[PDB]
Structure formats: structure tokens, C-alpha cells
Design a binder for these strands. Structure first.
Lengths: 278, 278
DNA sequence: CGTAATAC
DNA sequence: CGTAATAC
């Protein structure tokens, strides 16, 4: 039998003792419209997060279903979609409260053409949600992905100097061997090449950022956020951890918990939730 | 019962009496690789044409199956595919003999980015194969299609001044009501809008070119070259004539026949064959 | 390899 | 609405 993973209960109190005051939820919906048909929005209303980040929406701004506009609580909504590619990439950020400033992309024309980054600045921190480019089957985009990784790292380092940073989304890499079920087989596959894993480790050390889930559960294995639709991967928990909450070190005393909502359906990714005490 | 169409026998002698010396075949394969799996190449070897034009190949140059390189007779092969779009558009031209000159596109940067035109110049005439942009569901590209139509018309008029011209391929318009099964329903659908039909009539008169099939069969109805995969259109012969051989008037004394190979499978389009006596 | 999405 | 093709 396959070894399954049960995410531990929500810890809503920081180590300092302060109660959690902010609840961010991130989910790669892999088809915003199909995700809504599969009752994804119902799960969101059940989670009731202060902020909701979505990746791989595959939805142009004009094609957004009407129910999203009428969603309760998360009234302030921002979307980014590729200029010239239909049904590809795309992210979104939905918040209960209005952000002070909202910008798009990372400032480099080469990397801002697929709608992968939304930046939402708040009084106490800056939230970035990202959908990092996949290296592709055959590694056709691995050279581009290394260029992106370097540009994205410099971008986040500049943001982090002025304000504490929270980064979330599909970062499209399993950092370590614990972060995917079959590491020996995937050393040359997109998501686990040495170039991608190194860029991730360089990102954590340069900005600097910490992997919230791994920080709290350093030896917890079999904890994935993605399973291919093929070969019953999700039934057999043959997965990858591609979806992260990376925090600035100064927010670590405010970190309460980082969750993996393994049971939530509607995508080949599952949602992840962050609890902070600000 | 639906009214079916039987293409009359091949007339291989021109009205002047000269025997046919050139046999051009054009086919919108709508998926070059799927077309080869469906034994499309076998049909080509059975037709044995001097020149073979293909449209909507949906195949990048590096992904072309190996059997195409080893095809007998049609050894000189030229392909055009979109720069930035995978599995979209694309044409090809295969000839028994080497052409004097082979160029790509129509010379306008805006219209040469999807690989829709190949021009093959020969001693006695210039052959153009085209895959004209579809106006799209909802007519999103109808404004662009009118701009293309004007640029393409001027391009062909310049070619025709120096040499007699033969144009073939999917021109993505049913000229007249006879050219599609349900004209009253499609007046606002891509392929039969007033803008597309007028651009086609302006093309015939400006260059000038003649519709070879319609020239030879002025009152022959129910003669289509395309049927949607949906709703058993091909079984019920609910079709469109979108694929043409348009000739310069000076080649009309050399015109022997223009055929519609209704029974040839492998695509939602069927092939068309032209016989000339040069 | 499953699924969602495009284009026609 | 069928089919082929993409991207993951």
C-alpha cells in the first residue's frame, strides 16, 4: 500500500503566543473555469481566507466567470494574463482589504509577458504571488528558467530591503529529495533538475526567505501539493511539493502554521494556507 | 435523404486540345501528423501529383515525420510554420522538380508571422499556396482578416504582372451561396461574412484571377471541400467550398480540369487537384 | 500516459 | 457541439 500523508491540525498561535491575525490561501487552480465548476469556490468560502492567491488560471480577464466578481469577502480582485497567449498561465490575487499598492510583473520586459506575478503591498508587509515558468518536457525552457530565476531573485531582494516579504504560489521546483515521491527518477525532469533546485536554494539565501512548511516540519515526508492526473498519482500519493509560502526571516516570529490541504479537489494541485500573527 | 455530390471524371485535355502536362494537388491536412497516421501519404502516392500543397500542417519544422523526407517523387520540400505558435497554422509545398526561386510570406511583417504563404516560381508560372487567416468564432479576427485580404491582394497583383499566377489552398471563404450548404444561416459566421466574400470577389477582379472549379462548373451545386467534424456534416454533406485553384486569365486556355476529391479521408478538408497543359 | 484549454 | 494539437 502507498504511504499517505495527513496534515496535522491548524496551529493558530505563534511561538511567542500571539494569536493568528492573517490567513493567506494559495492554490494552483490549473483552469480557473474548470476549477469553479468543480466547486472550488465552495472550498474557498469554507476556508474564509483574508487573502487568496491563484495560479495557472488559464483565463483571460474578459472571460472571468461572473460568480468571481460576486464572491463574498474577497471583493478586491486583481488578475494578470498573458498578452498574446490564450488559455495559458495567468495568476490572480483576491483580498478582503484594499492593498496600498498593486503592481504586475518583475520589471523586466522579457519576463512580464505571461502574467505570472502580482505584487500586493500592505502596511506591514508585501505579498508576492508567483507562477514560475515550467522548464517543460525535454527541458526546452530550462535556459529561460535559469534567466527568470536570476531576475526574480534580484527583484525579490529589492522588495525585501524596504519591507518584509511573503512569497507564495507554484514555484515549480521540489527543493529537496523529501519534496517529491520519486526523486531518483526525476533528476533530469522539469521540477527537479540541478539548475532549478539550486536557483531555489540561492533564492532562499539571497533575499533571504525561509520555506515556511519545511521550517515547521523539517523531517515530515510524503507531503506534496501536486500530483499528475496520469497513473493515479493522487490515489497513490506519488506527488511533488511545488507550492510554497516563503517568508522573510523577520516574519518568522509571527509564523503560526503552514498547511497543505491534501483533500481539497478541483485541480492537480491542492491548496496551501499560511497563518501569520501581525 | 441528404443530397450528395459525385465529382465528374478527370478531363485531362484542354479545350484547345493540348494534353495535360502539370498536375497540382492541394490539401488542408488539418494536422500533418494525424493526417499521416490516417494514411494521407498513401492517397498522395496514389494521386502522383507533380506538385503538392499542404495547409494547416500544425507541425514545427523540427517535428516533421521522417516518412515525409523519404517521400518518392516530391523530393524538393519547403515548409513554413509560425515563429511563436506551436501546433497552429503552417503550410508546405512539395514538388517533383526544383523551383527557380522559393520565398515565404507576402512581405508585410504583420502578416508573415504565422507561416501561411509559400511562393514557388517556375519558368512558365508562379505558384502560391496560402492558408488565409480564419475570422474566428465571434469574428474576433474579422478586422485583421480584412487587412490581410487587402495586403494579400496587392501582393498577388504585383506577382501577376511579371508572370502568370496559380493560387491554391484554404482561402477560408465560400464565395457565393452555392459554395456552402446552409448559406442563410452563416451570413454572420466566419467564412461567409460580407467582408470575406467581398474581399474574395475583389481579389478575383483586381489581380485578376479566375475560380477554376466555378469557371468549369458554373451551376454545379453541393460541391464542398470542407465539413465540420461535428453533427455528421460529412455524412450529410453539410459542407463548404473553402479550397480553390485561382488562375490568371492567360492560363485559362491551358486549364483542363479542377477536381474535388470528395472521398479522400484524413482531414475535415478533402483534397483538390488541378490539371494544366503547359 | 489525464485534464483543461485552444482553434477551427 | 469532433478532432488535433498544446502544455503541464
Amino acid at each position: 500500500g502507498p504511504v499517505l500523508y495527513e496534515d496535522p491540525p491548524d496551529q493558530k498561535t505563534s511561538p511567542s503566543g500571539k494569536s493568528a491575525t492573517l490567513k493567506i490561501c494559495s492554490w494552483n487552480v490549473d483552469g480557473l473555469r474548470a476549477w469553479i465548476k468543480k466547486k472550488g469556490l465552495d472550498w474557498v468560502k469554507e476556508e474564509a481566507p483574508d487573502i487568496l492567491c491563484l495560479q495557472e488560471t488559464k483565463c483571460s480577464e474578459n472571460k472571468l466567470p461572473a460568480e468571481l466578481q460576486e464572491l463574498p469577502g474577497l471583493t478586491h480582485q486583481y488578475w494578470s494574463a498573458p498578452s498574446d497567449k490564450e488559455g495559458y498561465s495567468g495568476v490572480g490575487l483576491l483580498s478582503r482589504q484594499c492593498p496600498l499598492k498593486v503592481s504586475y510583473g518583475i520589471g523586466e520586459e522579457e519576463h512580464d509577458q505571461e502574467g505570472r506575478v502580482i505584487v500586493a503591498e500592505f502596511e506591514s508587509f508585501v505579498l508576492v504571488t508567483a507562477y514560475v515558468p515550467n522548464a517543460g518536457r525535454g527541458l526546452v525552457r530550462l535556459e529561460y528558467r535559469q534567466r527568470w530565476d536570476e531576475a526574480f531573485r534580484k527583484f525579490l531582494k529589492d522588495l525585501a530591503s524596504r519591507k518584509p516579504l511573503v512569497l507564495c504560489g507554484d514555484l515549480n521546483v521540489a527543493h529537496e529529495e523529501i519534496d517529491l515521491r520519486n526523486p531518483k527518477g526525476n533528476k533530469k525532469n522539469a521540477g527537479f533538475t540541478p539548475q532549478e533546485r539550486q536557483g531555489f536554494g540561492e533564492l532562499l539565501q539571497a533575499v533571504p526567505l525561509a520555506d515556511s512548511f519545511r521550517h515547521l516540519y523539517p523531517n515530515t515526508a510524503y507531503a506534496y501539493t501536486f500530483w499528475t492526473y496520469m497513473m493515479n498519482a493522487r490515489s497513490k500519493n506519488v506527488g511533488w511539493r511545488l507550492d510554497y509560502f516563503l517568508l522573510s526571516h523577520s516574519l518568522l516570529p509571527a509564523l503560526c502554521d503552514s498547511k497543505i490541504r491534501s483533500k481539497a479537489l478541483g485541480s492537480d494541485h491542492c491548496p496551501i494556507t499560511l497563518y501569520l500573527a501581525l
